[PDB]
Amino acid sequence: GMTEYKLVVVGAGGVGKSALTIQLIQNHFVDEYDPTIEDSYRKQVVIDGETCLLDILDTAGQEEYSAMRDQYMRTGEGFLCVFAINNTKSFEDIHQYREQIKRVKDSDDVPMVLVGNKCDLAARTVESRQAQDLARSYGIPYIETSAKTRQGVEDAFYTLVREIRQH
Amino acid sequence: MTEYKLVVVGAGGVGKSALTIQLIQNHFVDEYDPTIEDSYRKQVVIDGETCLLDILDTAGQEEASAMRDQYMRTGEGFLCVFAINNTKSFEDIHQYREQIKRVKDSDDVPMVLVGNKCDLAARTVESRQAQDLARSYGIPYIETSAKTRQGVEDAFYTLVREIRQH
Amino acid sequence: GQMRLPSADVYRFAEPDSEENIIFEEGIPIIKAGTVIKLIERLTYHMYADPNFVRTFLTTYRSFCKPQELLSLIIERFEIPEPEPTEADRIAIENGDQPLSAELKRFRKEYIQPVQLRVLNVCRHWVEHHFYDFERDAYLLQRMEEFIGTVRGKAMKKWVESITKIIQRKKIANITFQSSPPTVEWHISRPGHIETFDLLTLHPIEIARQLTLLESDLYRAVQPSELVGSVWTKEDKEINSPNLLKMIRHTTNLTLWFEKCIVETENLEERVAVVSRIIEILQVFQELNNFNGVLEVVSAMNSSPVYRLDHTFEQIPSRQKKILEEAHELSEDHYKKYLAKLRSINPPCVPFFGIYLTNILKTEEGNPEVLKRHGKELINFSKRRKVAEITGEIQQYQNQPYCLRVESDIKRFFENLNPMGNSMEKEFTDYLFNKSLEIEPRNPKPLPRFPKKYSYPLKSPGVRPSNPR
Ligand SMILES: Nc1nc2c(ncn2[C@@H]2O[C@H](COP(=O)(O)OP(=O)(O)NP(=O)(O)O)[C@@H](O)[C@H]2O)c(=O)[nH]1
Ligand SMILES: CCCNS(=O)(=O)c1ccc(F)cc1C
Ligand SMILES: [Mg+2]
Ligand code: NA
C-alpha cells in the first residue's frame, strides 16, 4: 500500500530536541502526550498529494548510550540533525553526527536536513546565516523550528521526506 | 499479565510486614516498625503464567482498627496472619475473617490462614487448632517464617491460585 | 448524614471540591488536576488510603511544591480543630450530667484519627523512601524531627515513637535464598591469576554471571531522584544522576570492549572465535534475563566497525547467527518484542534503562505543568502520575536479587575495564573503524592474511554449566 518512511532524529541532549517529534505526532491542538502508547511515533500524512506513513525514531534521553548510536542510526532512511539555536556546542556537534550517519549508512549522500530548534526564550547564539552556511556546505536544507508554537515542525519533516523522494 | 490484589491482615506484630518484605526483597526485617499502610508490586510466574501482584500491607495496631473497610473493599484475596507463639493473635483471626465477609458481602472470599514465626521453638498455638479453624473456613493453612523463608512463597502463591480459581 | 467539617476559614482543607480546585479523571477517584491544597487533602483523605498516590506524590511533588512548603502544608493538615459541644451536650452539662458527645466522638474516630494517621504515613514514606530531601536540607530534617517529636496524645503514640526512631536510623545509615548459588566456573585462567584474565580465558558462563551481578547492582542503585525532572539530561547531571550515569557508562564501556576485542583480533580464524565467544556470552545473558547485557552485545555487533565484517560472520555457525538475530529482533519496531519479553519473564532481571529514560523525558516535555480552568491554574497531576508509573516499574525490577556468587577478582577485572584508555571518544571510535578497514578491506581490495595472536586454545568450553559433587 502506502510508502512508509523511517526517519531518525539525532542531536545533542538537554536542549529540547524531543519537542520536534512530540509537536508533530501530537494531537496538534491538545498539548498532551503519552510516549508509551503503541504508535506514538507513527503518523499518516499527505505530502505533495501523496499519502505516506512516517515512522519516527527519537531516542531523546539516551544520548549517554553513545555506543548504541550506530545501530539506532542504521534503521533510518532519512535524518533530522537537530541543534538548539541558543546552544553553540550543539551546533558544533552537527559535523560529527553527519559524519557518523554517512559512515553507518555507507554513503556520502544520505537524505538529511539540518534543524535549528528554538527551545526557550534564552538568547540565540547561533545566527541563521551561520546555520544556512553550514547546510549549504553540506548540500542539505535548513529549517528552523519553535519548540512551543509548532512553527517549522511540519516543514522539517516534510522537507526530509522530499529529500528521500528525490534521492 | 493478570493483576492480583492481595491484602495481608492480622494482629500487630505477627510479621505481616516481615513476610511481605521477605517475599519482595528476600530480606528479613529485624525491626518492629508498626505499619500504617504500605503497598508493594511483584512480577512473578506462577504455574507458568506471568502475573503482577499488588500487595497491601496493613496496620495491625488496634488504634487503626476503624480504618479497614477501605482496604477490604479493594482486595481480591487476603492473607490472614497470626503468630504461632501468640495465642491472642490467633483469637483475633476470626474478627478479621468476619469483617472481610461483611465488607465484601460474600461467604466465598479467597483467603489463606498463615501461622507465622514457625522458626521459633516456643509455640503456643498448635498446628491442629489452626488447621481446624482453616477447615471451618474452607481455606488452606500454611505455616511460615519471614526469617528463614519457610513457607513464604507457598502462602502468597497459594492465595494467588485461589483468586485465579474464584 | 455526613460529618460536619471545620469552617474553611480556620481549616483550609474543608473547602468544598469544585472544578476550580480539583478535576477527576473519568473504586477510588483518580485525580487529573488540582490545587496543591486539594492534592494534599486527597493524599491524606479521611475516607480511604491511597498508597500508590503517596508514592506518586512523594516521587514527583518537587516540580510543583518545595520540600519546606510541603512540610508546612502537611503540618497544617494535621492540626484539625475539634467541634464544639452540640445542643444535646449543652443540655446534659447544664443538668450536671456527662454529655454523650456523640458527634465529637464520631469526628475524632472517622475524620481526625484517619487524617492524622495518613499524614504520619506521608511522613513515614517521606523519611523511608525519599530521605534525600533531608540529606540535602538539614533544616528540613530539624523541622520534621520537631514536628514528629511533639505530637501528643495516645492514638498516634506508637507511630510517632516509631517514626522518631526511623529518622534517627536513617541519619546514620542481607539476603536469603531458596537455594545455593551455582559453583563458579573456570576455564583457562585459574583462580587468583588475574593477570591472565581476558575475553577468551575466563569461562564464558562466568563472564556472563559476573557481568550480570555488576549490571544488576548498577541497575538497583538508580533512585527516582536521578530521573524526575529529566535531570540526567541537564547541565548538573553529574551531580543529580551519578548512579544512572555510572550504569550507562558501564554499558558503553562493555560494548566498546567487545568491539575492541573483535577488531584487534586481526587473524580471521581467531576473530571468528572471538565473535562466537561473545555470542555465547549473549546466550547466557538471555538465560539470566540480563537484557542490558543482551543489548550490550547486540549494540557491539551492529556497530559500524563490526557490522561490516562479512568474512567473519560468514564463518559463524548458523545456530549462533540465529541467537544473535533473535536478540536483535527484541529491539526492532521500537522494542516491541523486548517490552513483551520483559513483562513475561520471571525475575530477577536487568532491564535496559534507555527506554525508561526516553519515556520519562517525553512525558515531561510533552505535557503541561498546569491546566487552566475557570481562570485558575491547577497542577496537572496526570502528568506526574505518568512519570511515577515509569519510576514504579523501574523500582519493581530493582527488588529481586540474583542467586549468583560474586568472584571478587573477576568483578574487579570488569570494574576496571577501560578500552578507550586515555583517548577521546572520536579518536577511539575512528581507531576501531580503521582497524575494521585494515582487517577486512572494502571491496575490491583483497582480503589480507594476518598472524595469530593467541597462544592458548580457542575452543570454547561452552555455556552449559557443570556440577561436580
Ligand atoms: N523470629 C521471627 N521473628 C519474626 C518473624 N516475622 C516477623 N518477626 C519479627 O516480629 C516483629 C514484628 O514484625 P512485623 O513484620 O513488623 O509485624 P507486623 O505484623 O507487620 N506489625 P504491624 O501490624 O504493627 O505493622 C519484628 O521484630 C520482626 O523481626 C518470623 O517469621 N520469625
Ligand atoms: C540486518 C540486521 C543484522 N543484525 S544482527 O541480527 O545483530 C546480526 C545477525 C547475524 C549476523 F551475522 C550479524 C548481525 C550483526
Ligand atoms: Mg507491619
Ligand atoms: Na551557546
Side-chain angles (χ1 to χ4, degrees), chain B residues 26-27 43 50 63 70, chain C residues 158 174 342 344-345 396-397:
Chain B
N26 286 60
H27 166 67
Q43 173 178 322
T50 318
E63 289 77 5
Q70 52 93 23
Chain C
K158 294 173 180 173
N174 170 237
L342 177 63
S344 76
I345 53 78
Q396 187 278 133
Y397 295 118

Side-chain angles (χ1 to χ4, degrees), chain A residues 62-72 100, chain C residues 248 251-256 259 295-296 298-300 302-304 425 429:
Chain A
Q62 295 180 56
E63 292 78 16
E64 185 74 28
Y65 289 98
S66 58
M68 298 186 71
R69 256 194 246 119
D70 285 352
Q71 177 184 333
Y72 280 137
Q100 183 168 15
Chain C
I248 301 173
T251 292
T252 301
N253 274 335
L254 255 298
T255 302
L256 294 174
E259 298 178 28
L295 295 181
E296 284 172 345
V298 173
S299 297
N302 289 276
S303 66
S304 288
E425 180 193 345
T429 55

Side-chain angles (χ1 to χ4, degrees), chain B residues 16-17 33-35 57-58:
Chain B
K16 301 180 297 296
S17 297
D33 300 332
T35 305
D57 180 27
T58 67

Side-chain angles (χ1 to χ4, degrees), chain B residues 10-19 28-36 57-61 116-120 144-148, chain C residues 159:
Chain B
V14 300
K16 301 180 297 296
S17 297
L19 281 169
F28 174 61
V29 171
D30 279 287
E31 294 83 3
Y32 179 179
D33 300 332
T35 305
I36 297 171
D57 180 27
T58 67
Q61 302 308 313
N116 190 41
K117 310 200 184 180
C118 73
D119 56 284
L120 298 175
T144 60
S145 173
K147 180 173 178 178
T148 69
Chain C
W159 294 280

Side-chain angles (χ1 to χ4, degrees), chain C residues 185-241:
Chain C
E185 305 240 348
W186 295 96
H187 176 46
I188 293 163
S189 291
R190 302 315 300 185
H193 289 250
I194 69 181
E195 65 283 351
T196 68
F197 288 8
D198 209 344
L199 174 68
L200 298 174
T201 53
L202 289 170
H203 200 295
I205 297 176
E206 206 57 48
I207 291 171
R209 288 168 174 175
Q210 297 302 316
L211 281 171
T212 295
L213 285 171
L214 199 56
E215 291 170 12
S216 178
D217 281 351
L218 291 169
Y219 175 74
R220 290 164 56 101
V222 182
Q223 301 304 304
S225 67
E226 315 183 47
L227 309 178
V228 298
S230 307
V231 290
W232 79 93
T233 70
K234 297 188 176 318
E235 287 214 314
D236 288 342
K237 61 189 177 188
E238 306 282 352
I239 298 169
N240 291 313
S241 306

Side-chain angles (χ1 to χ4, degrees), chain B residues 21-88:
Chain B
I21 291 160
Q22 183 61 252
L23 185 79
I24 297 293
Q25 300 173 9
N26 286 60
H27 166 67
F28 174 61
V29 171
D30 279 287
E31 294 83 3
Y32 179 179
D33 300 332
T35 305
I36 297 171
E37 191 170 308
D38 293 339
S39 75
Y40 301 86
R41 287 193 133 188
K42 184 176 182 67
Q43 173 178 322
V44 55
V45 175
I46 299 170
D47 302 332
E49 193 159 324
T50 318
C51 55
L52 184 61
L53 309 186
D54 310 315
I55 302 173
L56 200 56
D57 180 27
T58 67
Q61 302 308 313
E62 286 306 322
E63 289 77 5
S65 66
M67 297 162 60
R68 302 181 182 152
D69 289 16
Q70 52 93 23
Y71 70 66
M72 291 174 177
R73 285 191 282 269
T74 70
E76 298 171 345
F78 299 79
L79 288 193
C80 295
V81 186
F82 68 97
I84 64 159
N85 67 340
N86 181 348
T87 53
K88 179 168 173 39

Side-chain angles (χ1 to χ4, degrees), chain C residues 352-412:
Chain C
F352 170 57
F353 226 107
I355 295 163
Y356 294 135
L357 301 184
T358 293
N359 286 341
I360 289 170
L361 177 64
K362 291 181 176 172
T363 300
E364 288 191 346
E365 172 69 37
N367 293 284
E369 295 285 80
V370 299
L371 301 181
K372 289 161 171 174
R373 299 286 189 273
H374 310 296
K376 313 293 177 173
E377 292 188 4
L378 305 181
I379 298 159
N380 180 6
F381 197 72
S382 72
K383 167 184 190 181
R384 279 75 173 193
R385 180 168 46 257
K386 289 179 186 170
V387 171
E389 280 173 6
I390 300 163
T391 63
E393 173 175 342
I394 292 164
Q395 293 188 279
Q396 187 278 133
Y397 295 118
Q398 296 177 316
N399 288 316
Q400 306 91 342
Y402 277 91
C403 185
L404 297 168
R405 185 175 286 98
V406 171
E407 214 294 332
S408 293
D409 286 332
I410 301 176
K411 170 185 181 59
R412 195 143 37 235

